[PDB]
UniProtKB/Swiss-Prot annotation, chains A, B, C, D:
Any Gene Ontology biological process: L-histidine biosynthetic process
Organism lineage string: Bacteria, Bacillati, Bacillota, Bacilli, Bacillales
Domain of life of the source: Bacteria
Record organism: Bacillus cereus (strain ATCC 14579 / DSM 31 / CCUG 7414 / JCM 2152 / NBRC 15305 / NCIMB 9373 / NCTC 2599 / NRRL B-3711)
Pfam families: PRA-PH
Protein name in the entry: Phosphoribosyl-ATP pyrophosphatase
InterPro entries for this protein: HisE, PRib-ATP_PPHydrolase-like
The enzyme's E.C. designation: 3.6.1.31
Gene behind this protein: hisE
Length: 92, 92, 92, 92
């Protein structure tokens, strides 16, 4: 599912649809995506303190979506992230 | 891999090892985890602006790890997150 | 000047003008202001890494403005902050 | 008081005392300070949601202190910030 989301974001980078939010992000670039990540992270904290589980899930996925858009924008392969996740898993 | 990481974090919540970082987080609770997420998010922004890909990957995975620890702490099932990811995928 | 800014924000809390941004913040409440602070903090980081001094100043003042709005909203006296600043000054 | 804090931080940049936290920040540089600002910002959010006024004040001043350290580090004059605060005041 995470791989599916990443692939979809990658497909938008090659076949741009100005109407789409992902393309809007790619056009505005790195700084726009980073601002979104910071904003979304604050939203996760606020949602968590409000004990709103549905909102925590929406905002956390929002953070993940923007992180993936950022990866694609900086040309960082998803597998590099997955390797790190596996390495981190082993440590634990 | 993401599921593997989550399961491992869940296993630590039931079988505590005070020596482990994950248990340290569960003992300090919600507020400690949230602070980590905010700090890590800032580190992702800084790393991205420094154009340090390796660091972006480490910090992003760091953000994901703490988000998963937070899910376990708030008793939010991983599948709830995955459902949201799939729904988000469909929209795109 | 910081005191002037705070006083002005306080005056808006008592004499609401729906057209104003400050009143918009008070009406939406705590969670809206906090989201703004997180977003603005991310903008400060981004601006600083871009080496854009003018932007750093605008965003930093933005952070300060929202922190003062937050103080007024939570009914925290400015002098309490100033006492802390002075105490911090002495430590240094 | 804010000017006093800034002046004190400036004095530390010229007469370094490795034992001091301010000099520790200047030595580690921009990225360390920015990380602190992000972390502190999260702490302000968490403290505010906890309704802990004393903590909100400590963390907010912490954010201000690190912003001033950042100004000194980037060689941004305090009056530039004050000009912006006054301009912002007039707009209101």
């Amino acid at each position: 599912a995470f791989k599916l989301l990443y692939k979809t974001i990658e497909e938008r980078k090659g076949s741009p649809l100005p109407e789409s939010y992902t393309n809007y992000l790619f056009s505005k670039g790195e700084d726009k995506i980073l601002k979104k990540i910071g904003e979304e992270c604050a939203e996760v904290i606020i949602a968590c303190k409000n004990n709103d589980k549905e909102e925590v899930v929406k905002e956390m996925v929002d953070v993940f979506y923007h992180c993936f858009v950022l990866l694609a924008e900086k040309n960082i392969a998803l597998e590099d992230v997955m390797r790190e996740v596996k390495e981190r898993n082993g440590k634990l």
